[PDB]
C-alpha cells in the first residue's frame, strides 16, 4: 500500500502471504475457512507456492507463523488475461490452519447485497508504500 | 527499498462504476469494483489482497485487489474483482470438496 499505517499485529486474523519457494512473497490472500483460502487469479498460484498466516514481519529471524502447504489450486473458469475480469482463485490446503488469537477467517457477502458507493472500507498487505 | 517487512493497513471510499469510468471507461466490467482515489492506492505486492467492509459488525470480504494506475498514483482509483459477482461459484466450489 501507498499511504497506509502499521496495522495492529494479528489485527487482521484472515491475512495470508504467498511465497514461492525462493521463499518470497508474491501475492496476498484471505482465509475463508480452516481448510480454504481466496486470492486473485492473475497471481499465477501453483501447488508449489506457500500460504503463510498469523505473520507480521518478513524480517523475522522467526515469528510464530504458519507455513502452510497447498493442495489444489482452484482457478476460475472465467479469468480473462487481457480483460482481467473474473480475477479470482481458491486454495484447498494439505492441512488446515489452526485458529488462534491471530489467525482466523473473513466473512463472505452474497451476490444479493449492496455495498454502496462512498462506503468506508479497508485494504491490507505488504505491497509498496512507494511506487 | 519501498518494501514493508511489516504489514500495512489502509482505509478508503467505494466508487460507483459510473464514477470509475471517468478514469477507466471501456475497461470496467460488470465484474470489477473501484475504490480509493482519496490519497491512497494498493501498489505492487498488494494484489490478491483483501477489500473489506463491516456489516452487522462482522467484517465482510467486499473485493479483491486486481490492478490500477501504472504509478500506484493516489489520485487514481484502484480496481478490485467484485466478490458480489463471484461468490456463487465460491459457494458452489466449497459445496463439493
Amino acid at each position: 500500500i501507498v499511504n497506509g499505517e502499521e496495522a495492529v499485529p494479528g489485527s487482521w486474523p484472515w491475512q495470508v502471504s504467498l511465497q514461492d519457494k525462493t521463499g518470497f512473497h508474491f501475492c496476498g490472500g484471505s482465509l475463508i475457512n480452516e481448510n480454504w483460502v481466496v486470492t486473485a487469479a492473475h497471481c499465477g498460484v501453483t501447488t508449489s507456492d506457500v500460504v503463510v498466516a498469523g505473520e507480521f514481519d518478513q524480517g523475522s529471524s522467526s515469528e510464530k507463523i504458519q507455513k502452510l502447504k497447498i493442495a489444489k489450486v482452484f482457478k476460475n473458469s472465467k479469468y480473462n488475461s487481457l480483460t482481467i475480469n473474473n480475477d479470482i482463485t481458491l486454495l484447498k490446503l494439505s492441512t488446515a490452519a489452526s485458529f488462534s488469537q491471530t489467525v482466523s477467517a473473513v466473512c463472505l457477502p452474497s451476490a444479493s447485497d449492496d455495498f454502496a458507493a462512498g462506503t468506508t472500507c479497508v485494504t491490507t498487505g505488504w505491497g509498496l508504500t512507494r511506487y | 527499498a519501498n518494501t514493508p517487512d511489516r504489514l500495512q493497513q489502509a482505509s478508503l471510499p467505494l466508487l460507483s462504476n459510473t464514477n470509475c469510468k471517468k478514469y477507466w471507461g471501456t475497461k470496467i466490467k460488470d465484474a470489477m469494483i473501484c475504490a480509493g482515489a482519496s490519497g491512497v492506492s494498493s501498489c505492487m505486492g498488494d494484489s490478491g489482497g483483501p477489500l473489506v467492509c463491516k456489516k452487522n459488525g462482522a467484517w465482510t470480504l467486499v473485493g479483491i485487489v486486481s490492478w490500477g494506475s501504472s504509478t500506484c498514483s493516489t489520485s487514481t482509483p484502484g480496481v478490485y474483482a467484485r466478490v458480489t459477482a463471484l461468490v456463487n461459484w465460491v459457494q458452489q466450489t466449497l459445496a463439493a470438496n
Binding site: 489485527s11 487482521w12 484472515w14 | -
Partner: peptide
C-alpha cells in the same frame, strides 16, 4: 466469523 480477537 470476522471478529478479530485482536481488535484492529
Amino acid at each position: 466469523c470476522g471478529v478479530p480477537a485482536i481488535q484492529p
